[PDB]
Amino acid sequence: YRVRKNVLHLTDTEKRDFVRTVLILKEKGIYDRYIAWHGAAGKFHTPPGSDRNAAHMSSAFLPWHREYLLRFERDLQSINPEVTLPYWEWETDAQMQDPSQSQIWSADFMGGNGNPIKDFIVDTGPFAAGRWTTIDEQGNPSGGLKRNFGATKEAPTLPTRDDVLNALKITQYDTPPWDMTSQNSFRNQLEGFINGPQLHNRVHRWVGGQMGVVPTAPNDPVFFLHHANVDRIWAVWQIIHRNQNYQPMKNGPFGQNFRDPMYPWNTTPEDVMNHRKLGYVYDIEL
Amino acid sequence: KYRVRKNVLHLTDTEKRDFVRTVLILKEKGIYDRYIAWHGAAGKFHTPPGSDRNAAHMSSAFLPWHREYLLRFERDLQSINPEVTLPYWEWETDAQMQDPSQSQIWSADFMGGNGNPIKDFIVDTGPFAAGRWTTIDEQGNPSGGLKRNFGATKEAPTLPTRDDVLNALKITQYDTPPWDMTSQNSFRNQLEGFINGPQLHNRVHRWVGGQMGVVPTAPNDPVFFLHHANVDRIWAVWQIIHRNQNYQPMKNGPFGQNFRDPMYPWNTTPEDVMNHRKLGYVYDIEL
Ligand SMILES: O=c1cc(CO)occ1O
Ligand SMILES: O=c1cc(CO)occ1O
Ligand SMILES: [Cu+2]
Ligand SMILES: [Cu+2]
Ligand SMILES: [Cu+2]
Ligand SMILES: [Cu+2]
């Protein structure tokens, strides 16, 4: 009974109220908690030595961010019980000749691309320099949100609808050894390591700026719209393959199994395995 | 009130073995590293950004943050053995000894001894010596062995004394503005050890050395938890003495420091842990 809408379906009042709430959460000090949580989990390797971490590059990538978004939406509701977390359906923006012309980058919502005169500092929209302070990898101020759409040779474009459809065909949620090299794995496909960077990883590299590296990515509010779409694609996968379940169920690295606590919380993947039990739904499901 | 935390020197040889056993299990399962990471992450979480205050140190939440830290750690201990509690290292009595390194807490059956200067002060005795206990660095990667170097600093050659503890218990205010290292007439800042620092809590970290000598890696040494168990005991004694003093600030402090603000990286507030008896544990001196 909580509907999360496509960004392009939002009214100008819904767009304004969401932007308003994020700014309030930022002013109170709640927003920075989520930046720090995401950076801390990126450093928590499972197990130490491997390149698996609690939030990425392993089987917990999807449930971790679902819990991440769940906690964020609850904090949104503390200020306004009418604001939900919209999702950025970037696979349809990619259909455009110039995806940077999408209304999600308008001055009334997320703001536009970075200014190459000012080292790609974003100077338009509610999160422009002077209105929205960022923190660096070390937790100290860094002086402004940056973006540089499609300025990389490994991610010049946004993922397509065909990329999403081909990932939904995968039968297994994940496969051993539950990491960057997992083949025939929906998790690793959606994450974007199969001929990477694609999908989730490509979207981060396409936006650039803080969004292009793990420890600083949540500095951009579009991080939450991005992962709201990733969580939707996962929820669609769970509906299609109704008789598949999370993997691994056991004997994976600690923090990756079905009932292990996900650092930095005690929440397990099972606790968030059914998003309707969490109290929200995506508009395409109705 | 139904769970007693004993002085380390009062433990039986069976209690010492079970505690060491449980900690090793928590390390093997992967739970122990969660506390290293939690402590490092909170040390980087400045409140507010720019200021010299973090969620776990250098401000009013220092004491309740570590109490919740110890509470969560003790619960994980009970999941493996529902009869093991968190003992405390009463370092104010070890300081009375001429050489505190001769204390039974550093025996091969418990914490092990001082570092070996031949091996760059790697600890080579006890259950946590190199080869039986792997450590992680500030970045979350293995670092290859616990180090200790007792009293090797010019600013903290000795352990704090009994008189240091008594003089801290005299302070009337829990904390004072601006709720940080410069707070004067503050029990919290006094106990932390920034009044003519390093003293008390801060001095103990500097005296042990090794990983214990810097914030992000300190929990790599299991004595980190025994140390803070004693800090939590002294606070609980202060709360009993000054029964009508309360946490400060109650409001209009930096977010994360007020009585009902969530303490990163949890949602726990200082009020949630303000009464340690309600949390389910008690110190043996209270009996
Ligand atoms: O912040 C991130 C950036 C990238 C780019 O690969 O991937 C994953 C992230 O969480
Ligand atoms: O973990 C810590 C390490 C040091 C070293 O001085 O001081 C204070 C701490 O809380
Ligand atoms: Cu992430
Ligand atoms: Cu991401
Ligand atoms: Cu600490
Ligand atoms: Cu300490």
Author numbering:
A (entry chain A): 5 to 290
B (entry chain B): 4 to 290
Authors' text:
Tyrosinases belong to the type 3 copper-containing protein family together with hemocynanins that serve as oxygen carriers, and catechol oxidases that are strict diphenolases34. Tyrosinases hydroxylate monophenols to form ortho-diphenols (monophenolase activity) and subsequently oxidize the o-diphenols to o-quinones (diphenolase activity). The two copper ions in the conserved active site, CuA and CuB, are coordinated by six histidine residues567. In this study, we elucidate the inhibition mechanism of these inhibitors by crystal structure determination of TyrBm with bound KA and HQ in the active site, along with biochemical characterizations, binding constants determination and molecular modeling.
We present here the crystal structure of TyrBm with KA bound in the active site at 2.6 Å resolution. Here, by modifying our protocol for ligand binding in crystal, we have visualized the structure of TyrBm with KA bound in the active site similar to tyrosinase substrates. In the active site, KA is stabilized by π-π interactions with His208 that coordinates CuB, similar to tyrosinase substrates, as presented by Goldfeder et al. and suggested in other studies. The hydroxyl group of KA is oriented towards CuA with a distance of 3.3 Å, while the distance of the carbonyl group to CuA is 5.5 Å. These results are supported by a recent docking study of Lima et al., and contradict a previously proposed inhibition mechanism of KA by copper chelation. However, the two orientations of KA, which are demonstrated by crystallography and in silico simulations, support the mixed inhibition mechanism, which is confirmed by our kinetic experiments. We suggest that when KA is bound strongly in the active site, the binding pocket is not accessible to substrate molecules, subsequently TyrBm is not active. However, when KA is oriented at the entrance of the active site, it restricts substrate entrance and product efflux, consequently, TyrBm cannot reach its maximum velocity.
